[PDB]
Ligand binder design. Structure first.
Ligand SMILES: CCCCCCCCCCCCCCCCCC(=O)O[C@@H](COC(=O)CCCCCCCCCCCCCCC)COP(=O)(O)OC[C@H](O)CO
Ligand SMILES: CCCCCCCCCCCCCCCCCC(=O)O[C@@H](COC(=O)CCCCCCCCCCCCCCC)COP(=O)(O)OC[C@H](O)CO
Ligand SMILES: CCCCCCCCCCCCCCCC(=O)OC[C@H](COP(=O)([O-])OCC[N+](C)(C)C)OC(=O)CCCCCCCCCCCCCCC
Ligand SMILES: CCCCCCCCCCCCCCCC(=O)OC[C@H](COP(=O)(O)OCCN)OC(=O)CCCCCCCCCCCCCCC
Ligand SMILES: CCCCCCCCCCCCCCCC(=O)OC[C@H](COP(=O)(O)OCCN)OC(=O)CCCCCCCCCCCCCCC
Ligand SMILES: CCCCCCCCCCCCCCCC(=O)OC[C@H](COP(=O)(O)OCCN)OC(=O)CCCCCCCCCCCCCCC
Ligand code: HEM
Ligand SMILES: COc1c(O)c(C)c(C/C=C(\C)CC/C=C(\C)CC/C=C(\C)CC/C=C(\C)CC/C=C(/C)CCC=C(C)C)c(O)c1OC
Lengths: 431, 55, 42, 352, 126, 352, 126
């Protein structure tokens, strides 16, 4: 169904859905990990863990309502799921937790307990999770000296530096009325439209969020977390992408979808696709493909992530993918364009209409904060049927033709060509 | 594996000319050897062209 | 000091805008290289 | 033949067919896993893999899943591709080829990789051994083919003949009107499949409690505990699992997982405690067993487990509605224990 | 290089045509048994080239017994030709023992590869 | 300290030194095995080869074996060269070097190869599991170091300091003169080792009977049976084992091994049935366990057992005074079944 | 290619003598810190060659921390020499920092090699 929005400082947006029967309500803030100086990165995740530390007992014992949160770059949200008849008590808990009282939550001993838990979690992430660590390092090395490269969970020193002063400063400078939007995804229709606009339901700090000076940039770079003890090799690539609210977002998404994903050990994924899959199937080269188009408010990131075990032929693995990108930017067949259209329609329908209201609420908040109104499935399909081979060619001429790239790798990367033999394979052939 | 490393002549050219893990502290002294090799080659070529019109 | 902090590069970074200008210089000088090499060989 | 669907204004459609035969009904050790890995390829009527590349070109995708008592073939597609996809599903659910020349090079490497991946994780191995000790060679068989027992093409074909029957089928779909699935299943190859007998058991399985196994695995020491649960009192163990895994209980930082598994006549309420060392594992499991045998109140979690169950139930095969009304108190009894990892230091069943 | 599917098509065209087949089958078998490979103890499938990747794919699916027999026949043929001799009419392949044991795999692989390469480069025209 | 020997006119001499500390007394899993593999090399003064190659050049060789409760160092040499061998042997057992830079390239690969060899044999794994299940982490310990529990060099040095003492050591060896062996020990480094305490256990161990384990093994299948036996009645199980493994009984062509292990405080009586397929193993073990529990007169076997015992126990280290004079009847009670190989088809302890 | 044991013998002979040590130790220190390798920030146990089997046997037994530090210092030296500069006056190694760490491995390995060589060709011992 269509969404309804209104705004008096606070914005109330609801996506009614009789199909589901788990009403949810939350608050999405427009400031995440992209609006914080590198002095102490780990503040947003610290707040998230604080919200996920002791109020869980309160919500479980008092009534029936489960709460969750997620912060990636600027979609800092605190969603509180519930039953259809318990939205009143859900908003009651939210009100009692985010305006008053706001002092007993920040107890000292609770703060050190949360700090220790977050330190353990970030250490575990650094030690174990390689596929996400390489992407985080790609983010760090793609936006050097800019509040868009610092990691979303911070560094060890950043967590251990500050205690309570900068946390409360962040709360006072980023938990405001200007960039706060409530969400009513679930099985509710109009009570959310009124309960948020109420005398008891107000947000503190009716001021303005501080504005940064240097917005964003992009410069090619390398990072080599070479840990040869690790068995496999994880590498990633990236090219300057496209931010949200641009009339090319779907074109970049389709360009990413054209090549698609691939898993070597899944027989179904081995028996489809495009020419590069056959080229890498002839001689075994890699195991995973993940063509991504990451989009944020300030800038974007369109690239490629993979993991391989045949450490000897990293150069061949990179060379084939770059040659296929060049083939895309020179000549595209219409059958692959049609199959990419169908696959993108399927994947976007799956993502935007999943059965879990939490993801739908997160997407609705991300759209409402920077758009003002959510774009429905039908309009997305209408705008994607107009994608043509000439449009894709023209778009790829500007973005994928002699543009800066950034590579992040770890594991056994001895055979990885440093920067010139990996960049000179774009416009140096018999064009 | 790329065709550049597949063809035997191209594979030899790549492994002996195009690709060679040379050290990263090379000064001009090491390039002096390749310069001398080129001088030897040009000397042979010019001598051959000299002897063609020689008695 | 974690590895997420890039070391100082401002002393060597290109402060000027228009990255195409450097690209234009590079490709123009590559073309000049090819031009002189071809003329000399001929 | 059971036929049903579901309709909603969402513009993405899902169709799934479930056959009531899996590793529980496998005659050999891992014949069911090989059948599932051999499922969606090599059809007689159309081609093998390219004639479904043209299917995914039309706006959808295919998937096959192996479970304890299900081999589900789900298809997700746009609102207009229902007839083609149902015809294709009926064509592949036809025990078509089972060609020996495309088994020693297509599904054995896949099954080997699956078994290796499942074996690397200690939790999956411990859970499998928990099933092995709780249930004998009835419901309890290895999900993933390892190689201890040899199987051939003829036995796979016999098992497919046993399972792929018209009577023992279940088809469901979302975002599809009831009427289209009412007819189109009848006017397709699926209605012309051989009519067998539903392998569904009319009686609960027999469980043996009080057993124990120990394995000298290398890695993270893992301790497990699993109680077999009948049908009469089945929501109590669900609310107990939600209570234990939540943050309301005083036991949250020392339990890796306390999930529950559901069947048509019962289930096995498992539990997991894991860590890299052994002293912490021993102390944690000892105090968990002690304060669970002592008895902890269970009423103040009914609303939370109701919410969790409601958000969980999105699949078609919704079980009997677990009325959470009659949940007052709990007292742990006889269970089954499995030790995995540095088993030399981990406590035994007697002194636990 | 010549597709085996075309060979099968021409073979079935000939085999069900009465007069032409009656004219061409006795000369066919006479040519087969004057070819000479029968004396050397060779089956026909051992003679066709086994180099291009499709033949390798066909070979890799043969049951082990056939591969062992083929290897023995190749080795014995090499040894026999090394001495320019021929073993007497005891190792000679009988008239009806030269049955193609490798044709069905070849035909299946031909069909699969042909339709793969046809549908790989395809258009969306009606 | 205990020094003994026996005289013989033959011209080949045997020198053996016993330390009564082994895998039974090992603090960790495979510290004893690594110690023994690290035992005879790189003395603090005697190099590994520069002064051990001459021992081969002199006309003798050195050996170091391991058991459940014995790492014996045995030396065999020509008759007229005892003092040099006793000097070198006393030099080696002096906590000499234990270099951290020789463990990771010399004895670790040897232990790895030994474990690889012992793993492929189903009977050895069955024996290990049977010991570990009949006896807990006391006498029953993993005999070979496999890497389940981490062991450090400092732990090896501590274990060697604990075991290589004066009281926990015996020197013996036949074919050598008594008095001169008694004299060539005081003027040796062996007279200056620390005088610790004997590691021998005063009382019998703790035995748990009636348990069961199952291991999924690829290859041959074996079904073992074990009985814990004290010192009071140990000759009865010896005569039973010899009667079973001989050709006098009908249960002879199917049983693989019927060995028995004796310690200073009791022992364990194993039994084996192994075949390539599980079809015959199940019936074989069923009938063996069925007719064993029926009882069998055993006295028509005493003389053969005396002969066998005489021919196996020719060593100077004589066993306890076994007295085969009161064996008349036998009847099995409760045992500790173990299943290796295929697990699905081999029967269960309940109905066996 | 010169044995380390002979150098150790000469050092032991010269250091223990009071007059020779007190007359030639400071001059040795000023030679070694005027050499130039301390200037770039390299420990002395890294400049020697790494191609003879003695070195290969030696640092194969080196602990993990020393090997990691050696690799870091080697790559930093390579980069610094490529850059045509010197490190600042804060990250160098002082006199106490250049502690010998590669000596005992060389001593033991070379003694083993020497006894191997002089024992393989032993005589009948007349
Ligand atoms: C009788 C001569 C007939 C034609 C000869 C053709 C070969 C010409 C070259 C002769 C030897 C030169 C020595 C160096 C050759 C290797 C050059 C090389 O490696 O450079 C590039 C390769 O250069 C080429 O040679 C590419 C072109 C292939 C040409 C094939 C034959 C064409 C024949 C037409 C005539 C060519 C000669 C014209 C002379 C004016 C590397 O880039 P890449 O694309 O291989 O790297 C990709 C990487 O993996 C990351 O993506
Ligand atoms: C001692 C006396 C001789 C000194 C010779 C060197 C200095 C005088 C000639 C060069 C003038 C200064 C230019 C910089 C020299 C230098 O140290 O750097 C060069 C370093 O180059 C070399 O090391 C080249 C080696 C040869 C150096 C000169 C040797 C002279 C030999 C002849 C001497 C004759 C004396 C007897 C005459 C009878 C080049 O570096 P760059 O500015 O290009 O940047 C670094 C480069 O791009 C990356 O490496
Ligand atoms: C063509 C040879 C006979 C020629 C007969 C007449 C002889 C005339 C004298 C010899 C000329 C040979 C060199 C050509 C002149 C030259 O300097 O060309 C430089 C170009 C640079 O152009 P590029 O290599 O494509 O790179 C730039 C890409 N942008 C982004 C600008 C589009 O190219 C290069 O840097 C070299 C790469 C490509 C060279 C042109 C094509 C050569 C094809 C040879 C194989 C053909 C099959
Ligand atoms: C050392 C001693 C010997 C010195 C020479 C050794 C190297 C050989 C050349 C390597 C250069 C190279 O390989 O150039 C490789 C480049 C392209 O390949 P690419 O990787 O840049 O782009 C491919 C990946 N994207 O083609 C050339 O330039 C060909 C040369 C063009 C200019 C000359 C044209 C011929 C006209 C006659 C000229 C006669 C002179
Ligand atoms: C027909 C067009 C010419 C062949 C192009 C081709 O055959 O192109 C395919 C390969 C490409 O090899 P590559 O290194 O250029 O791929 C680099 C980017 N991936 O080239 C060859 O195999 C050439 C082999 C023969 C060489 C001489 C050809 C002379 C033709 C007259
Ligand atoms: C190649 C290996 C070299 C190794 C080092 C040895 C040094 C030899 C070269 C040094 C110069 C010697 C005199 C050259 C005179 C000359 O070249 O004359 C020709 C022209 C000037 O004559 P012109 O144009 O007025 O026409 C006059 C007649 N009407 O000059 C040049 O184009 C010099 C530029 C050379 C560029 C590289 C060419 C490499 C050789 C071809 C490789 C293929
Ligand atoms: C690469 C090694 C060579 C060297 C160092 C060399 C050196 C010389 C020198 C020094 C001269 C003139 C003598 C003087 O002026 O001092 C000369 C002349 C000559 N060289 Fe070479 N040369 C070499 C190779 C060749 C080759 C390969 C040829 C092939 C034909 C050749 C042919 C000639 C001719 C024709 C002359 C003219 C005068 C004569 O007859 O010697 N040279 N060479
Ligand atoms: C290991 O790393 C390397 C490395 O890989 C390379 C390539 C080099 C470079 C090495 C060289 C340049 C030396 C190679 C030289 C040769 C192999 C010489 C071989 C050449 C000849 C013997 C003569 C060449 C022959 C011709 C040019 C034939 C054409 C001549 C004529 C007269 C015919 C034309 C006439 C008419 C009328 C058409 C190095 O220096 C180096 O160390 C850094």
């Amino acid at each position: 169904a269509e969404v309804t929005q209104l705004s008096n400082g606070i914005v109330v947006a609801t996506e009614h859905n009789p199909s589901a029967h788990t009403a949810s309500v939350g608050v999405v803030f427009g400031s995440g990990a992209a609006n914080e100086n590198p002095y102490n990165n780990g503040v947003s995740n610290l707040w998230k863990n604080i919200f996920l530390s002791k109020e869980n007992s309160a919500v479980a014992a008092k009534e029936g309502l489960a709460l969750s949160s997620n912060i990636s770059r600027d979609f800092q949200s605190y969603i509180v799921s519930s039953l259809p008849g318990s939205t009143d008590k859900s908003l009651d808990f939210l009100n009692q937790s985010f305006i008053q009282q706001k002092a007993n939550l920040l107890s000292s001993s609770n703060f050190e307990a949360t700090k220790k838990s977050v330190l353990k979690q970030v250490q575990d992430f650094e030690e174990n999770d390689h596929p996400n660590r390489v992407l985080e390092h790609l983010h760090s090395t793609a936006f050097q000296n800019t509040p868009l490269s610092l990691p979303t969970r911070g560094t060890l020193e950043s967590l251990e530096n500050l205690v309570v002063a900068d946390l409360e400063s962040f709360a006072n400078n980023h938990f405001l009325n200007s960039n706060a939007v409530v969400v009513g995804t679930g099985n509710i229709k109009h009570e959310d439209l009124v309960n948020s606009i109420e005398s008891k339901n107000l947000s503190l700090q009716t001021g303005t969020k501080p504005v940064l000076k240097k917005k964003a940039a992009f410069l090619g770079s390398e990072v080599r977390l070479r840990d040869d003890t690790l068995p496999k090799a994880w590498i990633s690539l990236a090219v300057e992408g496209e931010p949200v609210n641009s009339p090319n977002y779907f074109v970049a998404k389709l360009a990413a979808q054209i090549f698609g994903s691939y898993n070597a050990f899944e027989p179904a994924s081995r028996l489809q696709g495009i020419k590069l899959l056959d080229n890498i199937q002839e001689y075994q080269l890699c195991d995973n493909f993940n063509h991504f188009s990451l989009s944020y408010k300030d800038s974007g990131l369109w690239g490629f992530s993979t993991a391989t075990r045949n450490v000897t032929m990293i150069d061949d693995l990179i060379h084939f993918t770059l040659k296929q990108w060049n083939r895309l930017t020179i000549s595209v067949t219409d059958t692959e364009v049609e199959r990419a259209k169908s696959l993108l329609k399927l994947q976007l329908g799956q993502l935007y209409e999943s059965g879990n209201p939490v993801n739908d609420a997160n997407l609705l908040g991300a759209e409402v904060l920077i758009k003002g109104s959510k774009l429905s499935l039908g309009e997305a399909f209408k705008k994607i049927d107009a994608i043509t081979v000439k449009d894709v060619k023209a778009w790829a001429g500007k973005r994928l033709w002699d543009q800066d790239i950034a590579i992040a790798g770890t594991g056994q990367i001895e055979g990885l060509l440093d920067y010139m033999r990996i960049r000179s394979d774009m416009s140096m052939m018999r064009w | 594996m790329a065709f550049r490393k597949s063809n035997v002549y191209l594979s030899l050219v790549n492994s002996y000319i195009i690709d060679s893990p040379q050290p990263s502290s090379i000064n001009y002294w090491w390039n002096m050897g390749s310069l001398l090799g080129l001088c030897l080659v040009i000397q042979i070529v010019t001598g051959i062209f000299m002897a063609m019109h020689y008695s | 000091k974690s590895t997420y902090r890039t070391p100082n590069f401002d002393d060597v970074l290109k402060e000027n805008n228009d990255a195409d200008k450097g690209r234009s210089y590079a490709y123009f000088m590559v073309g000049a290289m090819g031009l002189l090499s071809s003329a000399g060989a001929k | 033949l059971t036929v049903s669907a579901r309709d909603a204004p969402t513009k993405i459609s899902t169709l799934a067919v479930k056959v009531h035969g899996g590793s529980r009904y496998a005659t050999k050790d891992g014949v069911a896993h090989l059948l599932n890995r051999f499922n969606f390829q090599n059809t007689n009527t159309r081609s093998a893999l390219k004639l479904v590349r043209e299917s995914e070109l039309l706006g959808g995708t295919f998937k096959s899943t192996l479970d304890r008592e299900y081999i589900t073939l789900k298809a997700t597609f746009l609102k207009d591709d229902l007839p083609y996809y149902v015809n294709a599903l009926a064509d592949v659910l036809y025990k078509t080829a089972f060609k020996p020349h495309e088994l020693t090079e297509s599904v054995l490497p896949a099954a080997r990789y699956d078994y290796a991946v499942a074996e690397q994780c200690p939790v999956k191995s411990a859970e499998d051994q928990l099933y092995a000790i709780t249930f004998r060679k009835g419901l309890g068989n290895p999900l993933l083919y390892d190689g201890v027992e040899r199987v051939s093409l003829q036995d796979i074909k016999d098992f497919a003949d046993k399972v792929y029957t018209k009577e023992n089928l279940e088809v469901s779909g979302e975002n599809v009107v009831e009427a289209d699935l009412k007819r189109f299943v009848d006017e397709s190859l699926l209605s012309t499949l051989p009519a067998g007998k539903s392998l569904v058991s009319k009686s609960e399985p027999k469980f043996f409690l009080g057993e124990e196994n120990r394995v000298r695995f290398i890695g993270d020491s893992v301790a497990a505990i699993g109680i077999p649960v009948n049908k009469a009192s089945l929501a109590q163990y669900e609310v107990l699992a939600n209570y234990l895994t939540s943050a309301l209980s005083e036991l949250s930082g020392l339990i890796s997982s306390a999930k529950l598994d559901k069947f048509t006549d019962g289930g096995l309420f498992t539990l997991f405690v894991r860590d890299q060392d052994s002293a912490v594992v021993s102390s944690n499991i000892k105090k968990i067993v002690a304060d669970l045998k002592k008895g902890k109140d269970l009423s103040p979690a009914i609303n939370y487990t109701k919410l969790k169950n409601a958000v969980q139930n999105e699949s078609v095969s919704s079980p009997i509605e677990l009325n959470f009304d009659a949940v007052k108190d709990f007292k742990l009894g006889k269970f089954n224990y499995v030790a995995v990892g540095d088993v030399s230091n981990l406590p035994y069943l007697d002194e636990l | 290089p010549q597709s085996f599917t075309s060979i099968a098509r021409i073979g079935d065209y000939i085999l069900k045509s009465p007069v032409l087949s009656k004219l061409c089958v006795p000369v066919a078998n006479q040519f087969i048994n004057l070819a000479g490979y029968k004396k050397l103890g060779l089956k026909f499938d051992d003679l066709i080239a086994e180099e291009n990747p499709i033949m390798q794919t066909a070979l890799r699916r043969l049951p082990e017994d056939e591969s062992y027999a083929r290897a023995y026949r190749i080795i014995r043929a090499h040894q026999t030709e090394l001495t320019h001799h021929l073993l007497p009419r005891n190792e000679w392949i009988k008239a009806q023992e030269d049955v193609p044991y490798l044709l069905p795999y070849i035909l299946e692989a031909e069909a699969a590869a042909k339709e793969k390469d046809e549908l790989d480069n395809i258009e969306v025209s009606k």
